[PDB]
Design a binder for this molecule. Structure first.
Ligand SMILES: [Zn+2]
Ligand SMILES: [Zn+2]
Length: 431
RNA sequence: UUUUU
């Protein structure tokens, strides 16, 4: 049995790993590259898509399913297994990819063709290919997210996919993986733990209470797939102690995802399922408004607070959020709250450096608004959680992380008496 | 830590 990394090697985007065992070739994920590597989505896979027997997708995020349609575009016609939630979410993520894609590398037909081969596979259901046995494990990173357990030829492999931050409340706790001969694991936060969640929430509530009281605007850059909805959940469960204010989910995509959530009730934590059982959607706080078009979106830039605005891009790389920052950063009564990681080198990092004035949309703008960074909202297991999940595993191969981050985790794993390496692109690893 | 008017 062997596993060949074909993305997310010494980097975070591009997840796709070819499992060679049981007499078959199974591709684990097939995400796109994002950021500076984006052009690479136009380059070849490094393997023959027509020679793939099946595909399993851990979760709906673009860096795990973005290249799936290129796979079909290039001949693949086999099944693609994923949980119903991933299937449902993927549809939304793929349609959006088409629209907002600079230089596309697949077309609408490649997408309908890809979605056409999706077959449901839920946690605790074994898939059988030749002498290979595959199952999904609970990852707690997104609704329907999972890690993969592959057993064949007398050996056991586990592919973590992306693990969640078990401290948060929306998703259920990640399951522990089975004891394996090899674990291909992510290490996004290999260098450090996250600030405790409960502590992050209180600080979050304090910032909102303070800002909305003085009639200011609370600007929140958010990702449309789970982050935004998680914020609303907090607003619903604790907003009772906040001054009255409209909450604008200024993201059509986050809107579509929100609408889908009630259909995915069983994929959330017991806490969230219990709310739904009482007929109460915990993702819809009082004052929730979903902004569909540009006109109303821009109108918010000139309308006074108090208000809470949720918008993308979550990493400030374009989107309505920029327009809100352009017109709201100059007012000291407002507040910019980051609830997700900002890649060093980008606009977020600059803002956080607190310079006298940052440049947005081709223009310098004074930075008077207060700024906060709540990494505690992260959707990835922090180093400490990564260490707990990996506990007792003889061998670990690290992917999905910046080289330094992966090294930091590796150092600790090696010191713990566990064999570890940083996966290399195309370099098969025996299981 | 991944699309977005
Ligand atoms: Zn993810
Ligand atoms: Zn990922």
């Amino acid at each position: 049995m062997r596993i060949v990394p074909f993305g997310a090697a010494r980097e975070v985007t591009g997840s796709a790993h070819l499992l060679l065992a049981g007499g078959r070739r199974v591709l684990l994920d097939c995400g796109m590259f994002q950021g500076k590597e984006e052009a690479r989505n136009h380059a070849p896979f490094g393997f023959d898509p027509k020679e793939v027997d099946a595909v399993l997708l851990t979760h709906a995020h673009l860096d795990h399913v973005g290249r799936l349609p290129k796979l079909f575009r290039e001949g693949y016609r086999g099944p693609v297994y994923a949980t119903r939630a991933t299937v449902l979410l993927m549809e939304i993520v793929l349609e959006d990819a088409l629209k907002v894609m600079d230089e596309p590398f697949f077309g609408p037909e490649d997408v309908e063709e890809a979605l056409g081969h999706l077959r449901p596979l839920e946690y605790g259901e074994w898939l059988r290919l030749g002498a290979l046995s595959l199952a999904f494990g609970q990852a707690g990173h997104l609704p329907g997210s999972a890690f993969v357990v592959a057993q064949g030829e007398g050996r056991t492999l586990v592919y973590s996919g992306d693990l969640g931050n078990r401290e948060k409340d929306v998703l259920p706790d990640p399951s522990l993986p089975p004891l394996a001969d090899l674990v291909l694991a992510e290490g996004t936060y290999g260098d450090r733990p996250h600030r405790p969640y409960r502590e992050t929430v209180r600080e979050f509530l304090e910032i909102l209470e303070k800002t909305l009281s003085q009639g200011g605007k609370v600007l929140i850059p958010t990702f449309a797939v789970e982050r935004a909805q998680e914020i609303l959940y907090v607003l619903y469960t604790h907003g009772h102690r906040l001054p009255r204010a409209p909450i604008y989910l200024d993201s059509p995509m986050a809107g579509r995802v929100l609408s889908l959530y009630p259909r995915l009730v069983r994929y959330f934590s017991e806490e969230v399922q219990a709310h739904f059982l009482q007929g109460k959607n915990p993702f819809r706080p009082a004052g929730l408004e979903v902004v569909e078009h540009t006109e109303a979106s821009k109108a918010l830039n000139r309308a006074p607070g108090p208000m809470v605005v949720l918008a993308g891009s979550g990493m400030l790389a374009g989107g309505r959020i920029l327009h809100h920052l352009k017109h709201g950063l100059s007012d000291p009564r407002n507040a910019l709250v980051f609830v997700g990681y900002q890649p060093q080198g980008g606009l977020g990092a600059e803002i956080i450096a607190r310079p006298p004035a940052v440049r947005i949309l081709g223009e310098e703008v004074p930075l008077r608004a207060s700024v906060h960074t709540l990494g505690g909202f992260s959707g990835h297991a922090g180093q400490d959680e990564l260490l707990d999940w990996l506990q007792g595993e003889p061998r670990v191969v690290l992917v999905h992380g910046e080289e330094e981050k992966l090294l930091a985790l590796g150092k600790l794993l090696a010191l713990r008496g566990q064999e570890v390496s940083l996966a290399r692109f195309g370099e098969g690893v025996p299981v």
